[PDB]
A = this chain, B = another copy of it.
């Protein structure tokens, strides 16, 4: 009398280059870049919350202070713009 259906959207893992700017880029910047890549790939523009190994990253923090090259962050889609 019922079937359980798990609706799944596959993760999209993006490789985002961080340019060689003297002004270092922020976590917020990184979220924007990932959202734009998502839009380019899927036609949807997500709002994103970034975590490193389960820990929330502050948007204002600078990428090199919190991440090493080729580290992975998880970006949760919280809504669609």
Task: With both chains docked as a complex, state the minimum distance between the C-beta of A5 and any C-beta of chain B, in angstroms.
Answer: 4
The answer to whether A63 touches B13 (Cβ under 8 A) is no
Closest Cβ neighbor of A41 among chain B residues? B7
- Number of copies of chain A assembled together: 2
The answer on a CB contact under 8 Å between B7 and A69 is no
Do residues A18 and B6 form an inter-chain contact, with CB atoms below 8 A?
no
- Name A's B-contacting residues (CB within 8 A): 1-20, 30, 33-34, 37-38, 42-44, 46, 48, 50, 63-64, 67, 69-77, 80
Instruction: Report 10 cross-chain contacts, Cβ distance below 8 Å, ordered by A residue.
Output: A1-B17, A4-B13, A5-B14, A5-B37, A6-B14, A6-B72, A6-B74, A7-B48, A8-B11, A44-B80
